[PDB]
Amino acid sequence: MNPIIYTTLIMTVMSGTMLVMISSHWLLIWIGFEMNLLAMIPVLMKNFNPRATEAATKYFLTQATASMMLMMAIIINLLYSGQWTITKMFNPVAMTMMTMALAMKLGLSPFHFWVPEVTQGISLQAGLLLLTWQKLAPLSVLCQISQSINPNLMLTMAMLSILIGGWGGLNQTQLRKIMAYSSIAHMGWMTAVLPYNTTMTILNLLIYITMTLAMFMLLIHSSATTTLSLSHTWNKMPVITSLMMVTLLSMGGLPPLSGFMPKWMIIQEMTKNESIIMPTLMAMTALLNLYFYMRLAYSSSLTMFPSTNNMKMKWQFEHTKQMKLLPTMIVLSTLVLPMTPALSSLN
């Protein structure tokens, strides 16, 4: 599309998210969600093809259903108490409806089915935007009402999301579906600490956003969407493969990388609340995410796959466009463990 139109649509998406984040009236939060949904579709459908159209219509259906459920929860809350402010929910039924709507917006299990297909359909830039920016508003809404959530339902869907992501990432060869399942697992990790501490949720969100930005920018730099296509990256730009391997190790939670910070802090916080079994199961399940990260690293950088003859022309050319902040994102997603006590800033 026209660059002016694209910039306006991106600004509208961001302004809808900010409207959700800064408003204190439930109707304004709903309006922000509607504005974000309205401006999101052309971004996903920027490169016109049947796959993008199918992904866009699936995303539209899911988000419209979630918004309708959220509106119903708001109306029930208003019925049982003449309040519009985002505070304690005031009703057991209203809270359940709202939690399911926000889980559907976030993609938490069992409402995860749309994320892998929407990510596969859209391009890598739309996938980056969808998996990074489209998590801020629902998570902020969940944080604002964290004192109302029933811990059983939140913990159940969090553990389900972790298990589903771990199991579903094992079966994928497409990189975008791998990233989608990783996002589902990380969402499950994020929502398992909302009943106890929202600062841990925000810290995990920041770390995951940095890691996902680094990974998607690396994937865009080496234009590969399949495992075998990424297996050709060493023959042209081995530094990109080495950085990608380090980032993958970080995303698996291996210390002393940055990705070890959120799991460590969440486990410690959950143990402070006399919860022992769930962190153990969560780490055991994150082992699966680490396994398929290791498989990707094996196929990418730790071994050398066969190449083709036509790579000799690619050897002669350099990337016309260089993405700013890629170096900063890699460093932030790799080497910030010693700066852990900085989380007291209420990030």
Ligand X SMILES: CCCCCCCCCCCCCCCCCC(=O)OC[C@H](COP(=O)([O-])OCC(O)COP(=O)([O-])OC[C@@H](COC(=O)CCCCCCCCCCCCCCCCC)OC(=O)CCCCCCCCCCCCCCCCC)OC(=O)CCCCCCCCCCCCCCCCC
Stretch of residues binding ligand X (CB under 6 A), selected from 20-28, 213-221, 232-240, 262-270: 213-221
Which residues ranging from 178 to 237 are in contact with ligand PEE (CB under 6 A)? none
Look at residue 338 and give the partner it binds from ligand X, ligand PEE, other proteins, none, a contact being a CB closer than 5 to 8 Å depending on partner kind. Answer: none
The number of residues in the chain equals 347
In the bound state with ligand PEE, the residue whose beta carbon lies nearer, of 51 and 272, is 272
CB of 140 vs other proteins, minimal distance in Å: 19
Which residues ranging from 106 to 165 are in contact with ligand X (CB under 6 A)? 125, 129, 132-133
Quick check: 150 binds other proteins (CB under 8 A)? yes
DSSP letter, residue 298: I
Q: Are 175 and 230 in contact (CB under 8 A)?
A: yes
The count of other CB atoms within 10 Å of the CB of residue 183 is 25
Q: After which residues is the chain broken (C to N over 2.5 A)?
A: none
Residue 252: C-alpha distances to residues 2, 103, 334 (Å): 39, 24, 11
Helices (H), 222-259: 227-230, 238-251
Quick check: 287 binds ligand PEE (CB under 6 A)? yes
Give the C-alpha separation, 140 to 307, whole Å.
46
Look at residue 285 and give the partner it binds from other proteins, ligand X, ligand PEE, none, a contact being a CB closer than 5 to 8 Å depending on partner kind. Answer: ligand PEE
- Number of chain residues interacting with other proteins (CB under 8 A): 129
Interacting residue with other proteins among 24, 229, 328, 347 (CB under 8 A): 229
CB of 164 vs ligand PEE, minimal distance in Å: 12
Quick check: 321 binds ligand X (CB under 6 A)? yes
Which residues ranging from 6 to 25 are in contact with ligand X (CB under 6 A)? 6-8, 10-11
Which of helix, strand or coil describes residue 174?
A: strand
Give the C-alpha separation, 275 to 154, whole Å.
14
Give the C-alpha separation, 38 to 33, whole Å.
9
Give the C-alpha separation, 72 to 99, whole Å.
12
Interacting residue with ligand PEE among 228, 276, 331, 339 (CB under 6 A): 276
**Binding positions for ligand PEE, rule: CB under 6 A:** 170, 274, 276-277, 280, 284-285, 287-288, 291, 295
Q: Which residues bind ligand X (CB under 6 A)?
A: 3-4, 6-8, 10-11, 125, 129, 132-133, 209, 213, 217, 220, 321, 323, 325
